Amino acid sequence: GAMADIGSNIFYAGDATKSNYFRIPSLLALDSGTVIAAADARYGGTHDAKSKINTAFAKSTDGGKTWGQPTLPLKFDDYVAKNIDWPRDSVGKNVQIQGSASYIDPVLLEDKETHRVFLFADMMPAGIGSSNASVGSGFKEVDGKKYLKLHWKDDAAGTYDYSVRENGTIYNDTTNSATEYSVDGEYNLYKNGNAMLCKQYDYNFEGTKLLETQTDTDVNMNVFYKDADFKVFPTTYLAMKYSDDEGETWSDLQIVSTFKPEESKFLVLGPGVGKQIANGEHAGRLIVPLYSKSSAELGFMYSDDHGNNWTYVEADQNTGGATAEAQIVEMPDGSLKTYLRTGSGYIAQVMSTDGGETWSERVPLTEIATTGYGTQLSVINYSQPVDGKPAILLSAPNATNGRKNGKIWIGLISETGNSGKDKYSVDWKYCYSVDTPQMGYSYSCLTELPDGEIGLLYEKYDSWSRNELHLKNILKYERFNIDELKVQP
Ligand SMILES: CC(=O)N[C@H]1[C@H]([C@H](O)[C@H](O)CO)OC(C(=O)O)=C[C@@H]1O
């Protein structure tokens, strides 16, 4: 590493998370000027769920120069957290953990009006990922009210005759009566006040066979575990916790996806950051991007009451479930521009003028090359004029073959003198090269730091490639002043 690369790891193999791998960066400068970050702690190599993944978290007091020890605010204990070197061979490289619960794909958001920070992540029951989730919400309605549904072990497959109700009281819905079972605030199970338990799994390889085997370590039976007496419906959930103390402590787990459409296979987070509206009618609205295999592809969830309640909105009617990972910026009036990945070989743009309730048709973004499968991007507002215009920054790879050639772009915003969603034009005038064209570059998250420097946490390899799986120390942190970035190639 060069002098300039010292301090370019936040999460790394050997830190406190006990993970050898990390993916999916999230980076956010708070209003106070503290800076926080989050990423997947991918234990079982860099595979997506299904796997064993927890959400990692760290922060910087010194404006993002330096980072504290990492924490695990969203974590499951059904399989142990350990440092294991995943095989990289033609056969083994493909092997993933079949039986663990996971948190995956974080989003960080701050309510600046209340100084509350929210952490969201997809919540996967045991052995589930987006690809093998079932169709359904995971909740039932009982006398008009939504309750998380549960399968008792000795009931017929696909039979969910129970529900978590007030106080975590588990009810039998056939007779509508409380049982002796309940869940606590962690969704761990109890029988007549007594903690239920089960044996934690280990995983070790013998050659290219992955051996997932019980140990003699008791952990709390959780409804998200493979070996629980009561089990949630095996679809994708959204989880959130909040902190008022900049991530020093976290609130209780919230399964917020009560709005998951019954017709959807998965509904998951567009990783990166969310947005608080600063200007206009809907100023103060909190909004978080989502995408799904459902009635719609792109969606959002928003709160007009500082995080207590969340409303789901569909931005299109595509049923094909392409990976429409999005990030959102604000126009100076306060309308929203969203930039998103697609599976159609380009990055797309959409506008909303009603605070994200409705959205315009997708518009391709010509200026940036990408692959057919696409990659996640990061877009943000910059607080300062740039050549005397309001500006945004976008980070994304810039190649048609592979995830590589990452750029940071500066877009300059103009009024076109037209009306509505067309009020504004973005001029992508600057294009900064992060490394070289053949260097790998995948997911990324920008933030503007306190001093007005631009921070970047990114995947410095190609995370799609089947030949770059299970690499360590690929998650890189760099800082730039705004003049560095003003390049015109
Ligand atoms: C929830 C989940 O799996 N998210 C993953 C997403 C997904 O795998 C798929 O592309 C669409 O269903 O893709 C990628 C990726 O590197 O492309 C990373 C995410 O971690």
Author numbering: 235 to 723
What does the paper say about this structure?
RgNanH catalytic domain (residues 243–723) was heterologously expressed and purified, and the crystal structure of the N-domain with the inserted I-domain (NI-domain) was solved to a maximum resolution of 1.71 Å.
Neu5Ac2en (IC50 of 1.4 mM) bound to RgNanH active site in a half-boat conformation, planar around the C2. There is a hydrogen bond between the first hydroxyl of the glycerol group (O7) and Asp282, which is similar to the interaction observed between Asp282 and the ethylene glycol group of 2,7-anhydro-Neu5Ac. Neu5Ac2en, an analogue of Neu5Ac dehydrated at C2, is a general sialidase inhibitor that inhibits both viral and bacterial sialidases, including the hydrolytic sialidase expressed by B. thetaiotaomicron. It has been proposed that Neu5Ac2en is a poor inhibitor and transition state mimic of IT-sialidases because the glycerol group is constrained by the C2=C3 bond and is unable to occupy the axial position required for catalysis, as also seen in the RgNanH–Neu5Ac2en complex.
